Amino acid sequence: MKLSEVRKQLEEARKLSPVELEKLVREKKRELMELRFQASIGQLSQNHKIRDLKRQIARLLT
Amino acid sequence: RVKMHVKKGDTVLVASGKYKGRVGKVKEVLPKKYAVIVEGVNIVKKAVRVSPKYPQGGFIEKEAPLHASKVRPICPACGKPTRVRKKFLENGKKIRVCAK
Amino acid sequence: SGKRPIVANSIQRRGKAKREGGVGKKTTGISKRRQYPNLQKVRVRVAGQEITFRVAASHIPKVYELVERAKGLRLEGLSPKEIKKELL
Amino acid sequence: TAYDVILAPVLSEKAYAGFAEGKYTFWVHPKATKTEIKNAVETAFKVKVVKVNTLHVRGKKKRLGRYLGKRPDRKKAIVQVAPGQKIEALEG
RNA sequence: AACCCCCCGAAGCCAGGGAGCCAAGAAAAGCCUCUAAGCACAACCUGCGGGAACCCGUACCGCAAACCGACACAGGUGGGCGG
RNA sequence: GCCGACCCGCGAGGGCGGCUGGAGGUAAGGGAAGUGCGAAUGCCGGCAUGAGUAACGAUAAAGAGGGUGAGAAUCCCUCUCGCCGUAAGCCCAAGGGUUCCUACGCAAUGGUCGUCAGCGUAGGGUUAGGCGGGACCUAAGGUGAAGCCGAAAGGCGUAGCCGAA
RNA sequence: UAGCGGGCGUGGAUCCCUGGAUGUCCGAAUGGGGGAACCCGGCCGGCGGGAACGCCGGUCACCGCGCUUUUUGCGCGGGGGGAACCUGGGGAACUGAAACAUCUCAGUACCCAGAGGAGAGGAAAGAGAAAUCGACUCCCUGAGUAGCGGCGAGCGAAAGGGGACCAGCCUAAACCGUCCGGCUUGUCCGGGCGGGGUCGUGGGGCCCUCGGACACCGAAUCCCCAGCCUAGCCGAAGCUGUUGGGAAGCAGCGCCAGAGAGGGUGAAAGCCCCGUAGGCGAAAGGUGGGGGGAUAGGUGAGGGUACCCGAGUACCCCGUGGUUCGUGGAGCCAUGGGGGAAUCUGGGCGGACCACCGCCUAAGGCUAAGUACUCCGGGUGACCGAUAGCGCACCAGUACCGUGAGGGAAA
Ligand SMILES: [Mg+2]
Ligand SMILES: [Mg+2]
Ligand SMILES: [Mg+2]
Ligand SMILES: [Mg+2]
Ligand SMILES: [Mg+2]
Ligand SMILES: [Mg+2]
Ligand SMILES: [Mg+2]
Ligand SMILES: [Mg+2]
Ligand SMILES: [Mg+2]
Ligand SMILES: [Mg+2]
Ligand SMILES: [Mg+2]
Ligand SMILES: [Mg+2]
Ligand SMILES: [Mg+2]
Ligand SMILES: [Mg+2]
Ligand SMILES: [Mg+2]
Ligand SMILES: [Mg+2]
Ligand SMILES: [Mg+2]
Ligand SMILES: [Mg+2]
Ligand SMILES: [Mg+2]
Ligand SMILES: [Mg+2]
Ligand SMILES: [Mg+2]
Ligand SMILES: [Mg+2]
Ligand SMILES: [Mg+2]
Ligand SMILES: [Mg+2]
Ligand SMILES: [Mg+2]
Ligand SMILES: [Mg+2]
Ligand SMILES: [Mg+2]
Ligand SMILES: [Mg+2]
Ligand SMILES: [Mg+2]
Ligand SMILES: [Mg+2]
Ligand SMILES: [Mg+2]
Ligand SMILES: [Mg+2]
Ligand SMILES: [Mg+2]
Ligand SMILES: [Mg+2]
Ligand SMILES: [Mg+2]
Ligand SMILES: [Mg+2]
Ligand SMILES: [Mg+2]
Ligand SMILES: [Mg+2]
């Protein structure tokens, strides 16, 4: 159901839109890196966070 | 698609074989193999476990899957086929001659 | 080649050598043979610049006749090949 | 896009010994100029790099059953941070 | 730790050295110089400073069990060092 | 499918009885064919014979003690011996492309053995402004603006471009 | 595709159908190079301290036609692929003739260029003997006839009749207006555009007369819709005994059927599951004269004038191809070479030629359907059942074999 959630947040991401788009994506991009960064070391990774964060970036980019 | 079939997760009778006539709630339904888990067919697994983690696994005689055709739904009256009636809005399913 | 107002691709056809009398009998000996169109180069002034033509001998006057049509046209400024195109 | 260049920290005693020095190293996107690496890691760790070196690593060939296999290719990258700073994240 | 004398000596170096002979022994850029267009508050030469300086290959075999000969084949394979 | 001394038929065959086997089979009477194999130096696969035979791939060469180990002529170490030394050593190129290194391991690969390996599973390892190649040039040659030619496909071809140990 | 590990779903996911977004590098590959998936740039703008460096987005190949007066630019198109089918340009040999050379194989194989769901052909300068038929394409038949032929081997029509389908059109010229530039300056030559015009009972142009307008014809183009494909939904009728590891077998008593085709369920089921009969369904995308509507275009008479009716063409000769036609008495359709007219008192043809009788209007273009094929989807089978059947039921054009075209398993 998280779809209907984040979606509206994006038209809401229209304070600054293209600007906050890049801003927000750059942030989630960092978080993604921070994720697999800790994921490779093992003792800081669960799983579902990645694919959710990935596809998260996707729709944001859309 | 179309993989859908008879009943889901609820009360169901079994006219299979080794557990004919029996009844129980269907706790699981795997559509891929077209079979459901009830409480009838339960065989003893001797194996300790496939995965080394958790030393003890169990000589458990847990529930074995069962072909989804030998099982039949049920209601106030015992054992009935399945008709369907589009509600005043949605799409519920009535039994042989009664509701749900 | 043969491309020009003529448009005559050279075609091949049989060239049979025969032996006979004509009013007694007749026999043969066959082979293929390519026939080329008699065609000649045709240089001509035409407005500014000069201009040639890899044209056939049949339609030689057709070029000069067309050169006349060209008078009723407006053309100038470096147009070697382009003239040919706009030249019908 | 700039965190996409840095892939993940290389885990080797050879990589670790670099930590003792001012040389942190890690995996990188295959097509990636040492210069763009500089700028990528520079703005990704709040540090200032001085000298970058790079390697290609032909992915070794594994197999399963009667089926041949080929691991993906990767790009090592070793950066020399300015003399007087560190990556607490890489330290770990 | 000594690490200094004497001797032989290259086909290598100074290298475009020289001599002789007849069969008469590459090309283009880097580089030096000359002027055109243009510009001459530029541009270019030199000196010092700061700054910048990428893409690919670097493992290993390599006269051979890793290359060419269906083979861990008495076969084949170019360049340098060879006390 | 395996066996039968039994019954029927001249015969090709059919019928019955036991054993196996685990799921299809198709009377009487008619129809249609990819319709019967012992041979083709027939095609495919399987298994025999020679036969425990010839051969284990350079006549440079081995012996011993210790260790590891389920098990050592063959793996590790020490000692003694022998062989190459314009090579049988060493560096580079081509080609080959992970065979390099390190753990665990021996069914097959190794012409025997194997605890070993160039083998299997896994991890790790190749760092360049100055070495080599490219953001340099040109050679044969390839290419190809213009230009020429050829039924079509295409072929010549100056400048330029590509092209190096 | 289980397992380690971590999640989503009635706030309706996973899946299926439609549209959209992203879409690295190669490849027609197209900024330049190149040993395909690599290497190097110019121009604008952004990023990092960012001038050297690097990255990101946009852009720059060539050829054709119209615009651009010029140069330069702007726009439209082309390029490449496709199993078989289709047209055009080229085009074998084995083999047959029991040899072989003309012939045959065959205009086949192959090469090449082009076309699209088709292609080609097509509204008579036709056929051919009926004072007849009436574009083209395909199926019967005509017919193994007519003929052809070292009259050997062999090759092989057409008219006509019967069917499918049905369709008919635009332009060139005479003549009027117009715009442009050229000159020997004219009442003109030519080019571009518009009007006019399209015929074989010959048609058109110009002038005169008719009253010559309302309707009549009506798309092959356009618009809406039916219907159809691209997901799906509903869907009658059974329960206990009995043998067994397992009922659907055997038994007893019932039921449905516009559904007793087939598949599955532990074995042999109309009534257990999936279905079948019958009947439902589309927001979106694709198709669609099947229906309706609009638009293009099109329609008459008589007399005179004799202006026009498609050129290196008709026609003739030399060389040849096509046709059933191999030089034969050799026409007809096409045409490499040479000569070379005319515009309806014109010109071709009806198998050399002449005459008479008669058919038809060349040298400009377009036209659906009936027809061919099957990469793709579906249905069916006196079709195979793993040495069969596609080479491949299985991660096969793979392993393996070749420098390379290419060859190519087993399972
Ligand atoms: Mg002439
Ligand atoms: Mg490098
Ligand atoms: Mg020497
Ligand atoms: Mg001499
Ligand atoms: Mg000067
Ligand atoms: Mg090295
Ligand atoms: Mg050897
Ligand atoms: Mg050996
Ligand atoms: Mg040698
Ligand atoms: Mg020496
Ligand atoms: Mg013997
Ligand atoms: Mg012996
Ligand atoms: Mg022992
Ligand atoms: Mg072994
Ligand atoms: Mg062995
Ligand atoms: Mg051992
Ligand atoms: Mg040259
Ligand atoms: Mg060339
Ligand atoms: Mg040249
Ligand atoms: Mg060059
Ligand atoms: Mg060089
Ligand atoms: Mg998976
Ligand atoms: Mg202008
Ligand atoms: Mg012959
Ligand atoms: Mg002969
Ligand atoms: Mg023939
Ligand atoms: Mg058509
Ligand atoms: Mg038909
Ligand atoms: Mg016929
Ligand atoms: Mg025939
Ligand atoms: Mg007109
Ligand atoms: Mg009109
Ligand atoms: Mg003839
Ligand atoms: Mg002619
Ligand atoms: Mg006409
Ligand atoms: Mg057509
Ligand atoms: Mg069968
Ligand atoms: Mg090979």
Coordinates of N, CA, C and O (backbone and C1' of nucleotides) and ligand atoms in Angstrom, one line a residue, chain F residues 138-143 159 161-163, ligand 17:
Chain F
rU138 P 49.9 11.8 -41.2 O5' 50.5 10.7 -42.1 C5' 51.4 11.0 -43.2 C4' 52.6 10.2 -43.2 C3' 52.5 8.8 -43.8 O3' 52.7 8.9 -45.2 C1' 53.7 8.6 -41.8
rA139 P 52.1 7.7 -46.1 O5' 53.1 6.5 -45.8 C5' 54.5 6.5 -46.2 C4' 55.1 5.1 -46.3 C3' 54.2 4.1 -47.0 O3' 54.3 4.2 -48.4 C1' 55.3 3.2 -45.1
rA140 P 53.0 4.1 -49.3 O5' 52.9 2.5 -49.6 C5' 53.9 1.9 -50.4 C4' 53.9 0.4 -50.1 C3' 52.6 -0.4 -50.4 O3' 52.5 -0.7 -51.8 C1' 53.4 -0.9 -48.2
rG141 P 51.1 -0.4 -52.6 O5' 50.0 -0.9 -51.6 C5' 49.8 -2.3 -51.4 C4' 48.9 -2.5 -50.2 C3' 47.5 -2.0 -50.2 O3' 46.6 -2.9 -50.9 C1' 48.4 -1.4 -48.2
rG142 P 45.3 -2.3 -51.6 O5' 44.4 -1.8 -50.4 C5' 43.8 -2.8 -49.5 C4' 43.1 -2.1 -48.3 C3' 42.0 -1.1 -48.7 O3' 40.8 -1.8 -49.0 C1' 43.4 -0.3 -47.0
rU143 P 39.8 -1.0 -50.1 O5' 39.5 0.4 -49.3 C5' 38.8 0.4 -48.1 C4' 38.8 1.8 -47.5 C3' 38.1 2.9 -48.3 O3' 36.7 2.9 -48.1 C1' 40.2 3.6 -47.4
rA159 P 47.4 12.0 -53.0 O5' 46.5 13.2 -52.4 C5' 46.8 14.5 -52.6 C4' 45.8 15.4 -51.9 C3' 45.6 15.2 -50.4 O3' 46.6 15.8 -49.6 C1' 43.5 15.4 -51.6
rC161 P 45.3 13.8 -42.8 O5' 44.3 12.6 -42.5 C5' 43.1 12.8 -41.8 C4' 42.2 11.5 -41.7 C3' 43.0 10.3 -41.3 O3' 43.2 10.2 -39.9 C1' 41.7 9.8 -43.2
rC162 P 44.5 9.5 -39.2 O5' 44.2 8.0 -39.4 C5' 43.0 7.4 -38.8 C4' 42.7 6.1 -39.3 C3' 43.8 5.0 -39.1 O3' 43.7 4.4 -37.8 C1' 43.1 4.9 -41.4
rG163 P 45.0 3.8 -37.1 O5' 45.7 2.9 -38.3 C5' 45.4 1.5 -38.4 C4' 46.4 0.9 -39.3 C3' 47.9 1.1 -38.8 O3' 48.3 0.0 -37.9 C1' 47.7 1.8 -41.1
Ligands
MG17 MG 49.7 6.8 -49.5

